[PDB]
């Protein structure tokens, strides 16, 4: 239970967003 929600912050499903955000700032600027 305690490790269930901790697995999310353990670095995985969120790190994915890290790669999704890098392209966001690139789409704005030219």
Q: So where are the chain's domains?
A: 1-30
Asked if 10 contacts 3 with a C-beta cutoff of 8 angstroms, the reply is no
Alpha carbon distance 15, 10 (integer Å):
10
Of all residues in the chain, what percent are helix, strand and coil, respectively (each to 5)? 75, 0, 25
> Up-side HSE of residue 16: CA atoms within 13 Å toward CB?
5
DSSP 8-state symbol, 12:
S
Burial readout 12-21 (b: 16 or more C-beta within 10 A, e: otherwise): eeeeeeeeee
Sign of CA dihedral 20, 24, 27, 30: negative
CA 2 – CA 29 distance, rounded (Å): 41
Q: Distance between CA 25 and CA 6 in Å, rounded?
A: 29
CA dihedral for 18, 23, 28, 30, sign (positive or negative): positive
């Amino acid at each position: 239970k305690k490790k269930l929600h901790f697995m999310y912050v353990g670095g995985g499903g969120f790190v994915l967003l890290f790669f999704v955000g890098c392209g966001v700032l690139l789409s704005k600027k030219k």
